[PDB]
Amino acid sequence: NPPPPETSNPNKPKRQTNQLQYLLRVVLKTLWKHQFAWPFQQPVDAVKLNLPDYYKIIKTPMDMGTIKKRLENNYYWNAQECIQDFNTMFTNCYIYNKPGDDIVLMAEALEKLFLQKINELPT
């Protein structure tokens, strides 16, 4: 396993915005409770899960546990930055697997719910 993505970085400029608060309170917390959220709630542990090539293939890992901690720690500058992390997480699943896999069906359902939730954001 490589080290997980950082959730603090003291030199990085941080912001709190209404959209970032919404991404935590509404978007993240809704997706977290979905019946398909559990594979995505923590960094992939390639040793535990017996995926020895996971990090041979996935070079920008991301997961909702990391995203949640980034939001809680005010790590982001803007909502787009956090949205990019969600997109990376979904894309990584599609890259490491293939169409029709159970894990891909999960990611697809979560991605559709995510898009539904970010279709309209606060101002």
Ligand SMILES: CCc1nnc2ccc(N[C@H](CO)Cc3c[nH]c4ccccc34)nn12
């Ligand atoms: C983000 C996690 C992730 N990304 N690519 C993958 C590829 C395999 C994988 N194995 C899961 C580890 O818990 C267990 C599992 C085996 N078949 C499944 C079908 C649906 C849901 C889980 C599984 N996890 N994985």
Ligand code: NA
């Ligand atoms: Na919304």
